[PDB]
């Protein structure tokens, strides 16, 4: 009579599941009279579980409905057990209770499967319930972008010529990037050694590479499957993508080229900020003294108020639409590159036996994902800011401004949004309101979210790390201006594009 | 939204010239089963839609549709009787169309087509 | 590339092992990985794939789709029933015969 301890928990669960299955159907729903082939009904139970785990529609052509009711009941039981265990161990791993090395690995595996089940469903739902960007939203976004670019007198990056001067510089930069990964050269393996060979030979003969690259950019529109796996940060999981090395070379080259040309023609205005000019702590410094240098930013004599709001975009990389994205990219690149990028995002994604096609979101492990994300992000900064304010911040195309500068004090003070910074998908805005602007805002907000019992104070979050002398004080007007500013910024974004 | 000229005019031309579509309409019937044709197993919709997320959830079992000609055959249990008028006279024919329903059906149906009138026995040993 | 000889050895391997054990099938071939064995089976060798000529229903489909979802061939393809490489080459083909 040995106990069931911690190492026998899963084996015991199955010992008992299959004892119960045997009892239940194979001798209370019999008339398998000679032998009820119980050893084969249990094989169907095992295959039903593997098909659940892999997300494959299980279907046994001629198999009685009582037996299928049994099998389905017991596989739903096992599914519930498996998933609840995943939930529980993830909470222990996140807060720090386990130090077991087998549990971290079983949990990463379980959450990888659960995520790919959910993502398969998201893609099928997209194709069935249609595109979520309506038609008027898509046309307004498209037309607004066109207006922006046309007023900045941007000229589109052309497809990279063969007799191009810098092609070799951009190719050597691409390959040095790809080589940094294998800087160490461990055991690595067959695929990593394939990649090292391809980089080494494109070093040996650069013009044959360049020729192959530009071929791909011209002709290729159906690619191989990428693999996926997760990096465990113990508090959240990060997805990691695995692209085949020939395509990796083409993408690295195109990545470098796009960024070179985009910055040479100034596609990105100065608020889009992982900028090459300053590290992030010098960014923080520049923000702080940008605030301090606004005009009369500290004076509250006549009832002004300054709000600083900061948020995210909550699912940008995941709701990017590849048809609207094709067309917004063609506004910017040559149509061959536009089609390469968009057809590169639509591939098969594979984990051990689960494969699905990506038709909705964007793959972030493609080498030109930085450019796509920052471009889409710029479209959304135009939605949030408006063409007029965004153009006052960006300054005239002949004499731009820099990170937080205006050409004059009048055009600085002509609006409540005084500073704006967008790091890849985090948004920091600094507002400065007069008494009447703050009053109109709070009316237009209370009108449409009536609060009689003064509940506006409850949900707020101030920082629990400063002293009590130093966090926010929750005075009714302050918490209402906070939520009014936020409720206003969150209406400028179509809910099907992104949210806040 | 009448945000600007190109949006307003685009949407006008779209809503006017646009009528519904055909191929994806087709892509985005199930023969209802009666007490006679309800088999003992099911279609597989529930099992498949349960172990896969990439289908729409159906939670109620449907009986399949057993068959046809086979469903006929387990009723065709009495004999066939045929007189062949050949050059030599009448040929009297009893057929256990119960235990050979495929072949008996075939012979009978070409006989009813009269596909067999004029056919000659090519051989005799 | 792939040769008739590799292809027939693949067909035989798959028909013995089944379509989830690509690693032993890849052990059976020289100069071939499981990634590549799998890709080949699901691109060309699978007897579900059809290599016929396009019914003009299939081609009116191809054209309508390839306009509604531009550049998205792995998504277009199953909606008509051939692989993405076939759809894509035959689509360029109609385009240039029409140009």
């Amino acid at each position: 009579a040995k106990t069931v301890t911690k190492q026998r928990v899963e084996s015991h669960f199955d010992l008992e599941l299959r004892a119960a299955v045997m009892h239940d159907i194979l001798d209370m729903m019999p008339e398998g009279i000679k032998q009820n082939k119980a050893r084969t009904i249990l094989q169907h139970l095992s295959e039903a579980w593997r098909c659940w785990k892999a997300n494959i529609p299980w279907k046994v052509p001629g198999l009685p409905t009582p037996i299928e009711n049994m099998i389905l009941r017991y596989v739903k039981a096992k599914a519930d057990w498996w998933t609840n265990t995943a939930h529980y161990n993830r909470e222990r791993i996140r807060r720090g209770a386990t130090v077991d090395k087998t549990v971290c690995k079983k949990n990463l595996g379980r959450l990888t499967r659960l995520y790919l089940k959910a993502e398969q469903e998201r893609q099928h739902n997209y194709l069935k319930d249609g595109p979520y960007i309506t038609a008027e939203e898509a046309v307004a976004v498209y037309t607004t972008t066109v207006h922006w670019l046309e007023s900045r007198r941007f000229s589109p990056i052309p497809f990279p010529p063969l007799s191009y001067k810098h092609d070799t510089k951009l190719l050597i930069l691409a390959l040095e990037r790809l080589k940094e990964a294998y800087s160490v050269k461990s055991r690595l393996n067959q695929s990593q050694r394939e990649e090292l060979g391809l980089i080494e030979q494109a070093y040996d003969n650069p013009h044959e590479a360049l020729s192959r690259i530009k071929r791909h950019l011209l002709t290729q529109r159906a690619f191989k499957e990428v693999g996926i796996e997760f990096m465990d940060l113990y508090s959240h999981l990060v997805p990691v993508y695995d692209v085949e090395p020939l395509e990796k070379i083409t993408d690295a080259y195109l990545d470098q080229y796009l960024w070179y040309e985009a910055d040479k023609r100034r596609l990105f205005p100065p608020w889009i900020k992982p900028a090459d000019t300053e590290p992030p702590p010098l960014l923080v410094y520049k923000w702080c003294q940008g605030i301090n240098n606004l005009q009369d930013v500290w004076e509250t004599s006549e009832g002004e108020c300054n709000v600083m709001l900061e948020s995210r975009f909550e699912k940008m990389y995941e709701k990017i639409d590849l048809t609207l994205l094709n067309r917004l990219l063609r506004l910017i690149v040559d149509h061959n590159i536009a089609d390469y990028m968009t057809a590169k995002n639509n591939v098969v994604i594979n984990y051990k036996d689960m494969n699905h096609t990506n038709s909705y979101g964007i793959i972030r492990g493609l080498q030109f994902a930085s450019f796509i994300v920052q471009y889409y992000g710029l479209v959304m900064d135009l939605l949030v800011l408006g063409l007029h304010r965004a153009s006052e911040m960006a300054g005239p195309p002949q004499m731009p401004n820099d990170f937080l500068s205006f050409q004059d004090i009048a055009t600085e003070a002509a609006h409540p949004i005084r500073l704006f910074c967008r790091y890849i998908d985090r948004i920091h805005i600094f507002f400065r309101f007069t008494a009447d602007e703050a009053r109109d805002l709070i009316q237009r907000y209370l009108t449409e979210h009536p609060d009689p019992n003064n509940e506006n104070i409850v949900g707020y979050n101030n920082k629990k790390c400063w002293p009590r002398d130093a966090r926010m004080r929750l005075m009714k007007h302050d918490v209402n201006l906070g939520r009014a500013v936020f409720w206003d910024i969150k209406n400028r974004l179509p809910r099907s594009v992104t949210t806040v | 939204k009448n945000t600007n000229a190109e949006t307003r005019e685009t949407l006008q031309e779209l809503y006017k010239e646009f009528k519904g579509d055909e191929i994806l309409a087709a892509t985005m019937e199930k023969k209802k089963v009666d007490k006679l044709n309800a088999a003992h197993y099911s279609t597989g919709k529930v099992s498949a839609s349960f172990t896969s997320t990439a289908m729409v959830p159906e939670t109620t079992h449907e009986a399949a549709a057993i068959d046809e000609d086979v469903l006929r055959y387990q009723f065709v249990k009495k004999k066939g009787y045929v007189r062949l008028h050949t050059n030599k006279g009448d040929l009297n024919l009893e057929l256990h169309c119960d235990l050979t329903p495929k072949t008996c059906e075939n012979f009978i149906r070409l006989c009813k087509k009269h596909y067999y009138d004029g056919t000659i026995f090519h051989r005799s040993i | 590339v792939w040769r008739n000889t590799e292809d027939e050895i693949l067909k035989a391997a798959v028909m013995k092992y089944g379509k989830n054990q690509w690693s032993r099938i890849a052990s059976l071939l020289h100069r071939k990985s499981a990634k590549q064995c799998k890709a080949r089976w699901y691109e060309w060798l699978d007897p579900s794939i059809k290599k016929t000529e396009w019914s003009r229903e299939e081609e009116e489909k191809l054209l309508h789709l390839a306009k509604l979802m531009p550049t998205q061939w792995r998504t277009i393809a199953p909606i008509i029933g051939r692989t993405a490489a076939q759809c894509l080459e035959h689509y360029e083909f109609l385009l240039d015969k029409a140009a």
Binding site: P30, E31, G32, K37, T40, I41, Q43, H44, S46, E47, R50, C51, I56, V60, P61, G62, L63, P64, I67, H124, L127, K128, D129, G130, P131, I133, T134, A135, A138, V139, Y142, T323, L324, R327 | T10, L11, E13, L14, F18, G20, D21, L24, A25, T27, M28 | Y17, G18, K19, N20, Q21, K67, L68, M69, P70, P78, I79
Partner: peptide, 29 residues
Amino acid sequence: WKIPPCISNWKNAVHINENFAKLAEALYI
């Protein structure tokens, strides 16, 4: 009450809405 034999997938020992059309055409226009 007869059970198929278990031949395995592991063991040896498309819908499209019709607003995709409306969206694509609106973008062309």
